[PDB]
Design a protein around this ligand. Structure first.
Ligand SMILES: Cc1cncc2cccc(S(=O)(=O)N3CCCNC[C@@H]3C)c12
Lengths: 20, 340
């Protein structure tokens, strides 16, 4: 399911902003 | 109704401008606060719970290493952060109480908001019901109306940046990429899952990217996961620019219709960016039950009230590895952060 893919992904914790 | 809005905001602009052109500056010092517990971390330094001793009030103080800001080329961004924040005033904007600097650090003592981060509640529970997310969405609709009207772009809306207070209401913390601009801006910034397509395609953009970021928030709140996700950023940007969004099955037809109009790639057909303005969102069928004046007034019953075992309680926040605040005997970066 789409949920299972998400909780098993590497972007489930706090997400950093980008800099450039 | 929409002339109360016109009038409310006009008065708010008189107010915000006085403070914009003459910012509050050096209204405290470090050794007036007891440092209790790191309650969160960002790229610039830590955020701590502190008690003001003369008064006994608790605040959250955000420390930023001046040298780390420079290296990160976030100097103009961090002057934006403070100047903007000291100058605004709205129920759903975390309050900047005091601000000051020393040889080593920038400090931003703000409203301590004890309920936790929308984020960690969203990840714990999984996902919010539509009524629940609507409550929050409404608070972000009214805040952006307030911000945009003062020429501000927020530019980093996410659950991580929304803090729930005692009454279950919201506080937009972190103003690190907010920016006062009339017309277009180009800095590549925000958080990847929330970037507008025009930001990715280096096109030059406006307040409408906050509106698209509203869509991602709502989707993420109601689905439990974001509309475009992957393990690496570059694969997220593929999925964003591609202009397709699958909705969960349990999503109501009205909610899917708001999101299709929010996460619209084409800027000329995206809600918030059209000639009716913010009202193509306020008068939308999904917010039909929503009483915007009662939301503003704090009169509605939040669907969730955070746990609160007393003043100075940090249980709705993680624990973090403690570290000394060190103040060099020499001044660093004084020319650059002069106006702070
Ligand atoms: C806990 C907290 C508690 N009270 C006020 C706050 C004001 C700003 C930031 C935080 S904070 O969460 O530590 N914080 C910054 C760290 C990175 N995460 C974003 C979030 C807004 C506060």
């Amino acid at each position: 399911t789409t949920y299972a893919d998400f909780i098993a992904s590497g972007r489930t914790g706090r997400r950093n902003a980008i800099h450039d | 109704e929409q002339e109360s809005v016109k009038e409310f905001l006009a008065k708010a602009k008189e107010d915000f401008l006085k403070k914009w052109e003459n910012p509050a500056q050096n209204t405290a010092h470090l050794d007036q606060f007891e440092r209790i517990k790191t309650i969160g971390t960002g790229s610039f330094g830590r955020v701590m719970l502190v008690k003001h001793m003369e008064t006994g009030n608790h605040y959250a103080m955000k420390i930023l290493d001046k040298q780390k800001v420079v290296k990160l080329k976030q100097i103009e961004h961090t002057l934006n952060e403070k100047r903007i924040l000291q100058a605004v005033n709205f129920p759903f904007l975390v309050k900047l109480e005091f601000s000051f600097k020393d040889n080593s650090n920038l400090y931003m003592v703000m409203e301590y908001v004890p309920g936790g981060e929308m984020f960690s509640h969203l990840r714990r529970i999984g996902r919010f019901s539509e009524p629940h997310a609507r409550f929050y969405a409404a608070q972000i609709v009214l805040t952006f109306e307030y911000l945009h009207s003062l020429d501000l772009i927020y530019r980093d809306l996410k659950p991580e940046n929304l803090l729930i207070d005692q009454q279950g209401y919201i506080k937009v913390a972190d103003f690190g990429f907010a920016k006062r601009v009339k017309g277009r801006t180009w800095t590549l910034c925000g958080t990847p899952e929330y970037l507008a397509p025009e930001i990715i395609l280096s096109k030059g953009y406006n307040k409408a990217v906050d509106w698209w970021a509203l869509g991602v928030l709502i989707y993420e709140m109601a689905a439990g996961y974001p509309p475009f996700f992957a393990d690496q950023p570059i694969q997220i940007y593929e999925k964003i620019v591609s202009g397709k969004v699958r909705f969960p099955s349990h999503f109501s037809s009205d909610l899917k219709d708001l999101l299709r109009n929010l996460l619209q790639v084409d800027l000329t057909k995206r809600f918030g960016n059209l000639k009716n303005g913010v009202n193509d969102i306020k008068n939308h069928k999904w917010f039909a039950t929503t009483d915007w004046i009662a939301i503003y007034q704090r009169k509605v019953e939040a669907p969730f009230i955070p746990k609160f075992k007393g003043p100075g309680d940090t249980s709705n926040f993680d624990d973090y590895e403690e570290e000394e605040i060190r103040v060099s005997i020499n001044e660093k970066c004084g020319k650059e952060f002069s106006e702070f």
